[PDB]
Write a protein that binds this ligand. Structure first.
Ligand SMILES: [Zn+2]
Lengths: 87, 143, 129, 94, 193, 81, 150
RNA sequence: UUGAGCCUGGUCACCGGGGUCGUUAACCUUCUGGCAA
RNA sequence: GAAUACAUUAGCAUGGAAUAAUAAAAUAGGACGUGUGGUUCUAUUUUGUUGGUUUCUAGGACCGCCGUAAUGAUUAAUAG
RNA sequence: CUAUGCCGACUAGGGAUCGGGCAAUGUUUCUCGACUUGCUCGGCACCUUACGAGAAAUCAAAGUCUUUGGGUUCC
C-alpha cells in the first residue's frame, strides 16, 4: 500500500502462491519453494540461472503440489508430455 | 342489481326539479358529468332509475380522494363492500406485512357488480354512517 | 425447489475458491448472474467466463484467478437508498476501500460506488471481495 | 388390452346402444355385431339375450362386473344391463 | 423476354433484383422438375456485403412463408448461383419484422409474439444463413476486457461447399447484427453417437 | 484437478457419464432401419421402443420391449443414421 | 423431490439439441397429422399415440416435424377431450381405489393412498381452473367421481 | 431491445448526460398548427 | 444578519424501467379502416328572437363482409 | 431415536451392498439364466482424512456462519 507521498509503507509484501494465487503467511511452515536450474546440451547446467516456484502449505497438505508443479513446469517449458489440460 | 320497476317504494320516485307538460312531450332527463375524466355511462344517459344517491342523474358530487379496490360483498341494495390490499412497512425488521381494510361504497344501476370487478370509487360525502364513496369506474373480470 | 439461482452461483464460486480450483461450473444461468459476473470481472475479481447455450436455461464456466475472499448474496433484496449505502458498506464490506456491493438500481445492475455516482438507489443484490 | 379399454375406444367413434329393449331391437334388426351382458343380470334375460344373439350371429360376452360397474365403465351415471355395439368404429373389439 | 421480370419482385432497385430476376427466368427456362419447383418462386431484395478479402457476397431477403420449396431447392441451386453471379457469394436470408419493446409511456395491447422477438429472429437468421450443417453447439465467451465473442459449432456432416462460406456468413452476421461470430466444425473421432 | 477443461471435456469422459450429467444433455438412443429376412421393405424402429412393432409384410415380431433396449431376434441388419 | 414420496429419482428424457427431422424421415408434415388424427379418432391417449409414432412409425419428436404438440394438433382439429389427460388419469386411479376401498373395509394403507390421490387431483384441478382450461365451476365430486372419469 | 458505429457541449485521458442517423422501428400513440401526396 | 438540514412514516407530483408482481389476440370473442353498404342520437350551427320533425353538416355508438400482414401457442428446468 | 424438521445447490479418497440400465468376438447353462469385470442413476450403510465445524465427545453433515442473509414451519 502507498500513502499520499506515494512511497510503499508496510513491513513487507508477502509472496503469492504460484498455483492458487494465495498469500503465504509468516508461519506457513508447510509451504515450500523449489528451484530448477536451466540445462544446456549435454548436461552441464548453467550456474546462476534458475526458475523458482512457491507452493503454499494448503496445496501441499491437500496433495495438489505434484500436479501444480507439473502444470507450472509445462507452462514454463521445462517439462513435456506429463500434464494435459484436456481431462 | 336486478332491473325492477322504478316505483318500488311507498312514495313516488322522481327527479327533483324535473317537470312534464303538454307543449313538450312529457319532460327531459337530467344528467351531469362527474368530472376528473370519468365519462357518464350510456345506461345512465338513457335509463329509468332515480337513485338520488348517485354521482350521475342525482345530486351528490364527487370530490376528495379517488380510490380503487376489489368487491368482497355485494349483498346489499345499491351498496357494496370493497377490500383494499396494501403492504405496511415495519421499520424494525425492514420488511412489509399484508394489511387490508374494508370500504363501503354506493353503486349506481348503470354498473353491474359481482365478486371481483375491480371498482374505482371517489369520495362523494357521507351517505349512511359508512358510505362516503361512489363507484365511478368498473374493470370487469369477464369483458 | 431452487429459490434464487444467484445464491447458488455465488455459493459455488466461493466454494471453488476456498477449494483452490481454478475453474467453476454454474447451472443454471440468468441475466442477473451475467450482470453480476460482468461487474466483478470489470472490477478484476473474475477472469473470462463462457456461457454454454443449450436448449435450456444455460450453463456458465468461469475461470477463477483467486483474489476473492468471499462473494455472497443478500436475501431478501432490501431496497437501498442513497444514505443506506454507507450503512451497508460498514456492515458487509471489510473497509471503505476494499469490497464491492452490487445494487440493481433503476439504471441497471452495477456496483455501489457507480450507483452512488449515478445518484440512484435500488435493491441490494450481493457483495464480493 | 381390456374390455373396459375397448369400450373406451368405441365410445368416441362407434355405434352402441344401451338397455334391454334397445339391444333386442338391434338384435332383431341384425346390425348388432356385439352384445355385452352385466354380471348381475337376470338369468332369464341372459338366456334370452344369448338366444337372440345366437340367432342373429352376434358375439356374446358376459364379462366380470355388476351392472353398476358396467355402467361406470360405459360412461353413465345409471346402471346398464346389456350393451349392443352395432359398429366398433376404429377399435378391434370384434 | 415474355414478362416474368417484374412479377418476381416487389420494388425496383438499380440492377440487383433486375439481374436476379433475369437469372431466375433463365434458370427456370429448363423444363421438368426445375420449372416445377421454380414456378412458385418469389424474391424481395438483395444487399451487398464485404469480407476481409476481396470476395463480395450478396444477401437476398426471401419472403418467409415459401421457405418449404427453398429447403429442397437451394441445396442444388447454390452452385449454379455462385457461378452465374460473377464470382460472388450468395446468401439466403429471411426478412423478418421486429416489434419495439413496450415502454411505460408506449402502451401497446397488440403484444409482441415470441416468434417476432429480436432474439428469436436473430437465432432464426443464424440458422438460415448457414442452412446446411444444422447447429449443434453454441458458446458465448466474454474476456476480461468485456468483449463478447460467440462460437457456433456446426455439424461435421456436409462440411464441404460451406467451409469457404462461413467467413462470408460471419461477415454478413456482423454487418446486420454486430455480434462477433466465429463458426467452427468438430472432429468426431472413432465411431458411436 | 485444480485445472480442468470444463468447456471441452474428454470424449472418453463424456461417454462414461450419465446422459444428463454431460456438459450438454442429449439422447443416447438411435433410430435404425430394419429389413425383413424374407422381404424387401424397410421399417424404422426405436432402440427403447415400448410397444411391439408389426411389419406390414410377411414377418414375425420385429422387436421385444425389454426394460432398456428392445431385443432383436430375427436375422436382420440395421443401419444407424 | 417427489411430490408424495421420499424418493429423489431423476429419470427423464433428454431432448436433442437439434430441432429438425432426420434426413431420411420425409414425414412431409401432413401424413403425420393425418396419422395423429386417425390415432385420436379411436380415442387413444395423446401420450400413448406419441409413443406409437416414436416406436412403430419411427417418427421423431412430433413437434420437430409438425411444428405443433400432440395436444395442440388435436385441439386445433377439434378432437379435444373434455378433460386433460393427467386430470382424467388421476380421476381413474382415484375411482379405482375408492371402488377397492368400498369392498375392502380394512385397508388403511389404501385409504391413505386414496387421500394422497385426492390431494393431488384437487391441486391439479385448482391449477386447471386458474389457467382456464376448464369451466370455472369444476368442483370435484367424490360420489360422482365415476361421472368425471366416465 | 440487444450489439456495434457517432458526435456533442461539460468537471474530476475517464466519467455523467442527449439523442436520432440505421442495421432492427425510430419517440408507440390521442388532439392541434401550418405543409398537403 | 436573524441561515441550512433533519421532512418521505402516510398523502400529491416529476423522471428511470434494473429487480418483483396481474392482464395483452386461442372456440380470434384482436391494431384491423380519408373503408366496400346502412342505422341511431346530440345539436356544438345557419334557415326570422322563442318551441317542434327532416337531415346536407361536426361528432359519440352499432350492424354480414371486405386480406391491409409473416396473422397468433417461449425452450420444455439433472422442477413437477 | 438417526435424542439430529422439510425442499434446493456445492464440497474428498476407497472398498463392499440392494434395485434398474448400458457394454463384454470374458467363463459357464439343459436363449436365456448363473458368475466376473467396467460405467451410470436411485437407496441402506462402512473405513480413512479433516480443507471445514464444534466446548469437546464427534460430524460428508452437526461443513459452505464475526468472511454472520437460498426458501419455510415447530420450539
Ligand atoms: Zn416383423
Amino acid at each position: 500500500m502507498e500513502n499520499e507521498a506515494g512511497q510503499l509503507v508496510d513491513l513487507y509484501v508477502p509472496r503469492k502462491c504460484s498455483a492458487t494465487n494465495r498469500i503465504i503467511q509468516a508461519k506457513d511452515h508447510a509451504s515450500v519453494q523449489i528451484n530448477v536450474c536451466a540445462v544446456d546440451a549435454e548436461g552441464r547446467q548453467i550456474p546462476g540461472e534458475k526458475t523458482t516456484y512457491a507452493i503454499s502449505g494448503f496445496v501441499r497438505s491437500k496433495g495438489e503440489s505434484d500436479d501444480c508443479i507439473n502444470r507450472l513446469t509445462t507452462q514454463d517449458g521445462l517439462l513435456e508430455g506429463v500434464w494435459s489440460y484436456q481431462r | 342489481a336486478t332491473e325492477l320497476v322504478v316505483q318500488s317504494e311507498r312514495a313516488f320516485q322522481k327527479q327533483p326539479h324535473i317537470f312534464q307538460n303538454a307543449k313538450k312531450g312529457a319532460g327531459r332527463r337530467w344528467y351531469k358529468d362527474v368530472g376528473l375524466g370519468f365519462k357518464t355511462p350510456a345506461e345512465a344517459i338513457y335509463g329509468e332509475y332515480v337513485d338520488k344517491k348517485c354521482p350521475f342523474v342525482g345530486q351528490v358530487s364527487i370530490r376528495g380522494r379517488i380510490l380503487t379496490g376489489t368487491v368482497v360483498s355485494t349483498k346489499m341494495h345499491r351498496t357494496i363492500i370493497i377490500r383494499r390490499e396494501y403492504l405496511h412497512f415495519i421499520p424494525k425488521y425492514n420488511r412489509y406485512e399484508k394489511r387490508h381494510k374494508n370500504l363501503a361504497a354506493h353503486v349506481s344501476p348503470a354498473f353491474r357488480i359481482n365478486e371481483g370487478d375491480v371498482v374505482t370509487v371517489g369520495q362523494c360525502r357521507p351517505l349512511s354512517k359508512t358510505v362516503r364513496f361512489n363507484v365511478l369506474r368498473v374493470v370487469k373480470h369477464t369483458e | 425447489v431452487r429459490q434464487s439461482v444467484l445464491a447458488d452461483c455465488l455459493n459455488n464460486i466461493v466454494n471453488a475458491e476456498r477449494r483452490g480450483r481454478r475453474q467453476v461450473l454454474i447451472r443454471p444461468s440468468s441475466k442477473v448472474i451475467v450482470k453480476f459476473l460482468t461487474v466483478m470481472q470489470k472490477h478484476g475479481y473474475i477472469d473470462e467466463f463462457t456461457e454454454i447455450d443449450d436448449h435450456r436455461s444455460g450453463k456458465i464456466v468461469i475461470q477463477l484467478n483467486g483474489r476473492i475472499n468471499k462473494c455472497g448474496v443478500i436475501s431478501p433484496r432490501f431496497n437501498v437508498k442513497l444514505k443506506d449505502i454507507e450503512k451497508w458498506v460498514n456492515q458487509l464490506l471489510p473497509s471503505r476501500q476494499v469490497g464491492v456491493i452490487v445494487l440493481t438500481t433503476s439504471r441497471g445492475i452495477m456496483s455501489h460506488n457507480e450507483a452512488r455516482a449515478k445518484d440512484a438507489g435500488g435493491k441490494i443484490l450481493g457483495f464480493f471481495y | 388390452d381390456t374390455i373396459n379399454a375397448k369400450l373406451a375406444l368405441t365410445m368416441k367413434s362407434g355405434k352402441y346402444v344401451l338397455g334391454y329393449k334397445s339391444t333386442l331391437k338391434t338384435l332383431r334388426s341384425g346390425k348388432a355385431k356385439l352384445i355385452l351382458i352385466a354380471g348381475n343380470c337376470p338369468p332369464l334375460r341372459k338366456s334370452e339375450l344369448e338366444y337372440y344373439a345366437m340367432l342373429s350371429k352376434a358375439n356374446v360376452h358376459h364379462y366380470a362386473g355388476t351392472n353398476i360397474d358396467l355402467g361406470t365403465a360405459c360412461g353413465k351415471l345409471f346402471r346398464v344391463g346389456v350393451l349392443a355395439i352395432t359398429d366398433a368404429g376404429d377399435s378391434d373389439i370384434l | 423476354a415474355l414478362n416474368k421480370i417484374v412479377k418476381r419482385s416487389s420494388s425496383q432497385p438499380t440492377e440487383t433484383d433486375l439481374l436476379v430476376a433475369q437469372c431466375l427466368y433463365d434458370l427456370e427456362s429448363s423444363s421438368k422438375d426445375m420449372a416445377k419447383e421454380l414456378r412458385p418462386l418469389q424474391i424481395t431484395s438483395a444487399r451487398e456485403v464485404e469480407v476481409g478479402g476481396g470476395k463480395k457476397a450478396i444477401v437476398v431477403f426471401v419472403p418467409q412463408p415459401l421457405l418449404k420449396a427453398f429447403h429442397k431447392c437451394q441445396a442444388r441451386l447454390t452452385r449454379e448461383l455462385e457461378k452465374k453471379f460473377a464470382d460472388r457469394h450468395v446468401i439466403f436470408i429471411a426478412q423478418r419484422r421486429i416489434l419495439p419493446k413496450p415502454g411505460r409511456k408506449s402502451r401497446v395491447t397488440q403484444k409482441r409474439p415470441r416468434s417476432r422477438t429480436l432474439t428469436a429472429v436473430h437465432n432464426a437468421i443464424l440458422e438460415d444463413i448457414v442452412f446446411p450443417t444444422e447447429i449443434i453447439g453454441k458458446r458465448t465467451r466474454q474476456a476480461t476486457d468485456g468483449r463478447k465473442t460467440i462460437k457456433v459449432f456446426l455439424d461435421n456432416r456436409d462440411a464441404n461447399t460451406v467451409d469457404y462460406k462461413l467467413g462470408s456468413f460471419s461477415s454478413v452476421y456482423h454487418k446486420l447484427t454486430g455480434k462477433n461470430v466465429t463458426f467452427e466444425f468438430p472432429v468426431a473421432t472413432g465411431e458411436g453417437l | 484437478v485444480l485445472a480442468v477443461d470444463l468447456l471441452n471435456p474428454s470424449h472418453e469422459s463424456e461417454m462414461r457419464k450419465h446422459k444428463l450429467k454431460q456438459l450438454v444433455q442429449g439422447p443416447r438412443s438411435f433410430f435404425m432401419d430394419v429389413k425383413c429376412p424374407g422381404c424387401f421393405n424397410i421399417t424404422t424402429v426405436f432402440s427403447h421402443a415400448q410397444t411391439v412393432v408389426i411389419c406390414g409384410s410377411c414377418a414375425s415380431v420385429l422387436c421385444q420391449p425389454t426394460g432398456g433396449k428392445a431385443r432383436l431376434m430375427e436375422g436382420c441388419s440395421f443401419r444407424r443414421k | 423431490g417427489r411430490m408424495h414420496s421420499k424418493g429423489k429419482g431423476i429419470a427423464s428424457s433428454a431432448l436433442p439439441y437439434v430441432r429438425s427431422p432426420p434426413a431420411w424421415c420425409k414425414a412431409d408434415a401432413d401424413s403425420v397429422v393425418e396419422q395423429i388424427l386417425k390415432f385420436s379418432k379411436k380415442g387413444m391417449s395423446p401420450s400413448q399415440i406419441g409413443v406409437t409414432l416414436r416406436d412403430s412409425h419411427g417418427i421423431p419428436q412430433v413437434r420437430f416435424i409438425t411444428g405443433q404438440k400432440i395436444m395442440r394438433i388435436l385441439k386445433a382439429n377439434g378432437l379435444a377431450p373434455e378433460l386433460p389427460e393427467d386430470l382424467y388419469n388421476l380421476i381413474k386411479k382415484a375411482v379405482s381405489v375408492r371402488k377397492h376401498l368400498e369392498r375392502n373395509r380394512k385397508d388403511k394403507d389404501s385409504k391413505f393412498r386414496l387421500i394422497l390421490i385426492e390431494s393431488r387431483i384437487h391441486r391439479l384441478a385448482r391449477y386447471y381452473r386458474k389457467v382456464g382450461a376448464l369451466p370455472p365451476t369444476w368442483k370435484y365430486e367424490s360420489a360422482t367421481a365415476s361421472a368425471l372419469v366416465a
